[PDB]
């Protein structure tokens, strides 16, 4: 009862005459809704991961996956090890997040150089063949390739770069094979000292150790922007409710509030809206394309007017900023009172 | 000559956390800042009158 809440706030068993601010009241949510895109196909994940004929480190292939459904549960079809590090996002069953645009890169590198595929690393591969940005968001997957990339004489189809003029900007591809002159002389010759051909093969032989074993690596680069989200995950939709408190998941955006019809002149390109406080205030349903206004559930402060406990025990309650009709009646439990 | 000033009240949980419950659970673990802030604001409000 209000008197006991006043006692708990004051940390005393006896209260004097006055008015005390105890706590706040707010209407607790009822249902749950989820609206996600309507696409039903599946993303070309199986045309990059397996990829019988594969790519080299200095000409790494790039695939642009768009307008499909992403299921990251179907990845456990390979031998273990599956090193597997996601930066800026966790993979522990977080395939429930929509995404703007996804890049897939793939290359084979050596054993000890798998650690070089990470932000803030300096090394031969890091500054000569492939460099991630400092604030990169995405995932890196690595696995062994002895069973599929082994040959008796060693495969020369795999090469890497050791010498170049300077470092690489993030996500930059170099294919040039022009000679690299070092000391003073003009070179312009096929071979000779200071006249270097900037490519060296791996020569992978099964007789080598684990640290020399070929490793195949795939890198997924994600993007989060103010876009309709093309790619997404397998989350079922749900009929939307209006004029009624409801926690919602609109295309990856979680919130809680009363969703109503809005009459704000959204232009065709505009996706959502914001207010003075830099918060979401209007959203477009990505199945009916209707603008909806968001307004949180009623809330306010509660005060207890009481004479001294030595005088009586009955109290009065003041709800601050409420029009005496928005005072909730409650059904079983929908108030923090 | 000015005499009085506008009386303001601040709700901790709705400002810091908002519509998140786990944030409130973590916020329970950072002491009694909210009691101090609410008490100071109430003192100013009474002083104005």
């Amino acid at each position: 009862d209000p008197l006991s809440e006043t006692k708990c706030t004051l940390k005393s068993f006896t209260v004097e005459k006055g008015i005390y601010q105890t706590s706040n009241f707010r209407v607790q949510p009822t249902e749950s809704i989820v609206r996600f895109p309507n696409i039903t196909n599946l993303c070309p994940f199986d045309e990059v991961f397996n990829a019988t004929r594969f790519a080299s480190v200095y000409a790494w292939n790039r695939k642009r996956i768009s307008n499909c459904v992403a299921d990251y549960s179907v990845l456990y079809n390979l031998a273990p090890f599956f090193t597997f590090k996601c930066y800026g996002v966790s993979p522990t069953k977080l395939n429930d997040l929509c995404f703007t645009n996804v890049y897939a890169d793939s290359f084979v590198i050596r054993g000890d150089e798998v650690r070089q595929i990470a932000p803030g690393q300096t090394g031969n591969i890091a500054d000569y063949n492939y460099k991630l940005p400092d604030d990169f968001t995405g995932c890196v997957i690595a696995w062994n390739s002895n069973k599929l990339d082994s040959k008796v004489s060693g495969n020369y189809n795999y090469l890497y770069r050791l010498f170049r003029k300077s470092n690489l900007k993030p996500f930059e591809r170099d294919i040039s094979t022009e000679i690299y002159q070092a000391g003073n002389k003009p070179c312009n010759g096929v071979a000779g000292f200071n006249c270097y051909f900037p490519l060296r093969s791996y020569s992978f032989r099964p007789t080598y150790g684990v640290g020399h074993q070929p490793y195949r690596v795939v890198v997924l680069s994600f993007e989060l922007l103010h876009a309709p989200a093309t790619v997404c995950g397998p989350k079922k939709s749900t009929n939307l409710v209006k004029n009624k408190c409801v926690n919602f998941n609109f295309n990856g955006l979680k919130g809680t509030g009363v969703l109503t019809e809005s009459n704000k002149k959204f232009l065709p390109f505009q996706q959502f809206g914001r207010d003075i406080a830099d918060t979401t205030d209007a959203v477009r349903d990505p199945q009916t394309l209707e603008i909806l206004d968001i307004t949180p559930c009623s809330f306010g402060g509660v005060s207890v007017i009481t004479p001294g406990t030595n005088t009586s025990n009955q109290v009065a309650v003041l709800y601050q900023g409420v029009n005496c009709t928005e005072v909730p009646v409650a059904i079983h439990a929908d108030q923090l009172t | 000559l000015p005499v009085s000033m506008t009386k303001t009240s601040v709700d901790c949980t709705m400002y810091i956390c908002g519509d998140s419950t786990e944030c409130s659970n973590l916020l329970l673990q950072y002491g009694s800042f909210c009691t101090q802030l609410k008490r100071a604001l109430t003192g100013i409000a009474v002083e104005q009158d």
Binding site: A277, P296, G301, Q320, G321 | K7, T8, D11, C12, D49
Partner: peptide, 28 residues
């Protein structure tokens, strides 16, 4: 008369303004 949506935006973040005890008529 010489001294004079933002209020709603402030209120939705937990910042409210309380009324005075004495109205203008009483001061007058």
């Amino acid at each position: 008369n010489k001294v004079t949506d933002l209020i709603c935006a402030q209120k939705f973040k937990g910042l409210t303004v309380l009324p005075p005890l004495l109205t203008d008529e009483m001061i007058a």
